[model samples]
Target: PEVFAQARLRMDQLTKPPRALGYLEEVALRLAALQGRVKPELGRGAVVVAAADHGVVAEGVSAYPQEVTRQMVLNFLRGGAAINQFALAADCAVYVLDVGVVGELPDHPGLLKRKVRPGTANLAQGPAMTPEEAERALLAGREAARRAIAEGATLLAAGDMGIGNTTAAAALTAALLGLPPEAVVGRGTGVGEEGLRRKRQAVARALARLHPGMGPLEVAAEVGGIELVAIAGIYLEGYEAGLPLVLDGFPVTAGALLAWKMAPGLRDHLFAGHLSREPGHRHQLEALGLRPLLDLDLALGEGTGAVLAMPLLRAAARILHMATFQEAGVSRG
Candidate 1:
C-alpha cells in the first residue's frame, strides 16, 4: 500500500502556497490515499445512473409519470439528456441501469437491464421489498459497478432516476437520521400542495412500518426504492475496489447513507459531488460527515454535478501529478 502522508508531503511542495486549492487539496490527499498511491491516476470515471420506478408513484407523489423513468433511460442511451452531455463534457462513460423500472425497455445496446423487479411495492401500503429482494437490489448494483470498473472506471459515480424515489429517499432519510417526515419532504423537482400531502402521507405511512432500532436493510426493505438500493450497492462496490465513490444528490446520498450503514467505512472513500438543493440532502451529508466538493444550486439529481466534479478532482490529482518547485525550477508562489 502507498503512503497517504506522502501525498500530503508532495502536496506541500507543489510550487504553490500550502493548501492554496482549499478542499481540493483535501481531495488530492484523500484520492491518493483511496487509490493507494501518491501518484494515482484520475483519467477515467464512470457515471452510473440507476433508473427505476417507485410503487409510491401510485400515490401521486411526482408530477412526472412513472413511464418517464424508462423514457429517460432510453433518452440517455440516445444521448439526449443533460446527463449524457455532462458525461461527454467530462470525458466519462455514461451507464444507465434499469434497476427496477415498471415497463420493458427497448433492446438498446447501451442500456444495462439489471432489473431486480419490475418495480417495488408501494411503501405506503407496506414493506416495499422483501428482505431477500433488497439484497438482490444491492447485488444488481454491485454487478453494474463492476461492469463499468471492468471496462475501465478508475472512479465511480452513482445517480438515480425514479418516479417516486424522493419519497423513498425521504422515508430512508427520516428513518436513518431519526427525523420527522416533514423534515425531509420536498417536491423532488415535481410536487405541489395537494401532491405534497400525498407525498407526506406516503412517507409517514412508510416510516410507520419501520420500528425504531431496526437495521439499515430492514429500513430499506420496509421502505426502500429499488433504484435507491441499487445506488447504495454502486458505492459499496466502489469501496470494495478502493475507488473514489462519487455522491450526487438526495436519492444518491440517501443511498450512500444506506451503504455507509451497511458497511461503515465506505464513507472513507466517498466524495460528495455537491451539496444538493434538495431538502434532506444537507442533513444526509451531515450525518455522513462528508464535505461536499461543490456547493451548486441544482436540485436535479442526474449526476451532472457528479461528473462535473470529476474535472475538479482531476485537477486535485494534478496537485500531486504536476511538477514541484524543484522540478519546475521555480520558487513557491
Candidate 2:
C-alpha cells in the first residue's frame, strides 16, 4: 500500500495533466507494487505457447481441422507465425510447448516437449481426460513457468495453440459462469453462423454431462483441453513466483479462470492482454474483474494479443521511471 501511494505520488508530480496516461498510469502503479520498486525493470519476459488438440473438433465446432494445431506448432518453432513476429519485435523469448498436440512434433530448440497426452477426448461425448491427466497437464505448465523464470524471465505471457479448443473453452466458461451455452459460445476461427450453432450445442451437451459441483482441477480434467490446463498451471505457478501473467484470448483466459478458481488471489498476478472476439472471453474477464489493455476484436490465440501489449507495459515503466518530475528541473509552471 505504501509503495502504491509513493508511485501514485510520483505520477502526480510528473509534468502532465492529472491522470493523463489514464489506465496506463494505473498499470504503472500496479507494476511498481508488484515488483516492490517504484521503477521496476520490464524488459525481460517470455511468451509461452502451450499446444494441444481437441477431439471436439470432430463435432464440427471449429472452422479449422485438428491437424492445424500441429502445423501451427511447427510454424511457431520455425518463427513463421504472428506470435513470433510480435515477440521478436518486443525482444521477448518464445517457448512452444507440446502439451497435447495430436501428432508427434520433431525436436526443436525452441520447442519444449511436455506431452500430457496426444490429444484430449471429445468433451461433447464425455470427460476430456481423467483427473490424473489434468494434473499432469497442470504440472507441465507449472514447469514451463519455472523454466521461463529460470531463463531470466521477469514477466510472462500465456498463450494457446489448439484447434477446436474453443469448444472446450466454451464448455468451461458455461459451466463456471452458469451462463447459457449460446451466451458464452462464439465463432472461433470464424466458424461462421452454422459452426457457431454447432459449437453452442456441443457446449450445452458437454455441460449437461459434467457434474456441476466439480472443483477447478476436476472441471479442467473433465472439460478443459490440455493446453488450457497447462495455461492454468502457468497462472497458478507464475503468481506464486511473483511474475505477472499476460493472458491472450479465449482459450488462455479459460485456463486463467480455472487458475483463479484454484486461488482467488491469483487475480493480482494477471493482466488481460486484450479483449478477444470470442464472447466467452468477455465473460471470463468480467468474472475476473479485469479490463483488457486492448480491444481490437482479436481472436488469434497464439499469444499474439499478449505480445502486442508488451510495448504498453514497457511504456508504462518508462513513464514511471524515465519521465522527469517538476522537481527534477522540468518546469511545471
Candidate 3:
C-alpha cells in the first residue's frame, strides 16, 4: 500500500497537473506493482503463437477450411502474417508452437514441436480431449512461457490459431460463465448468419454434455481446443513466473478464463489486448475484470491485437521513468 501511495504522490508531483497522463498513469501504477518496483522494465517482450486444429470444424461453423490453420502457421514461419509484421514493428520476438496441429508440420527452426495430440476431438460428438491430453497441452504452454522467460522476455503475449476454435471458445465461455450459447457465440472469421446459427447450436450441444462439477482442466479436456488449453497453460505459467501477460482476442481470452479458474490469482498478471469483435470476448474480459487497451473492430486473431499494444505498454513505462518532477528544476503551477 505504501509503495503505491508514494507512486501516486510522485505522479502528482510531476511537472504536469494532477492526472494529466490519464490511463497511462494508471498503467504505470499497475506496472509498478507487478514489477515490485517504482519504474517497471518492459524493454523485452515476446509473443508466443500456439497453433492447433479443431475437429469442431466438421460442424460447418467456420468460414475458412481447416487447412488454413496449417497454411497460416507456414505464413507465420515465412514472416508474412499480420502477427509477424506487428511483432516486428514492436521489436518483439515471435515463437510459433504447433501444440496440436493436425498435419505433420515440416520442421521449422522457428516452430516449437509440442503436439499433445494430432488435434482435438469434435466436442459436438464427445470430449475434445482426455484429461491426460489436456494436462500435456497445458504443460506444453507452460514450457513455451519458460522458454520466452529464459530468453529474457519480461512481458508475454498469448496468441492462437485454429479453425472453428471460436466454437470451442464459445462453448468454454458458456460453460464457465453459465450464459446461453447465443449470448456467447459470434461469427468467427466472418461467419454468415447461417454459420452463426450453426456455431451457437454446436456450442450449446457441447455445453449440454459437459459436467458443471468438472474442474477447469477437466472442463478444458471436455470442451476446449488444444491451442486454447496451451494458451491457458501459458497464462498460468506467466502468473507463476511473475510476467505480465497480454491476451489477444476471443480464443486467447477463452484460454485465459480457464486459466483464471484454475488459478484465481492469475487475474493480477493479465492485460487485455483489445475488445474482440466476438461477443464472448467482452463477456470473458468483464468476467476477468480487465479493460482492454483497444477496440478496433478486430476479429482477426494470431496475437496481432496483443502485439499492437506493446508500444503503449513500453511508452507507459517510459513516461513513468522519464518524466521529471517539479522538484527537478521544473516549475509547477
Clashing pairs in model 1, backbone N/Cα/C closer than 3 A: none
On TM-score, who's better, 1 or 2?
2
At residue 54, give the lDDT of candidate 2. Answer: 89
- Candidate 3 residue 122 Cα shift, in angstroms, is 0.9
For model 2, residues 168-249, the per-residue Cα lDDT tens digits are: 9988878877878888888788878889888888887788876757787887787779999999988888899998788899
TM-score of model 2 vs. true structure: 0.96
Query: Residues 169-218, candidate 1, lDDT per residue (tens digit)?
Result: 99998988888878888868667788878888898998888786789988
Q: What is the RMSD, in Å, between candidate 1 and the native fold over all Cα? A: 1.6
CA deviation > 4 Å runs, candidate 1: none
Better of 2 and 3 by lDDT: 3
Task: Say which candidate scores most in lDDT.
Answer: 3
lDDT of 2: 0.86
List candidate 2 segments past 4 Å from native. 322-326, 330-333
Tell me how far the alpha carbon of residue 205 in candidate 1 is from the true structure, in angstroms, after superposition.
Answer: 1.0
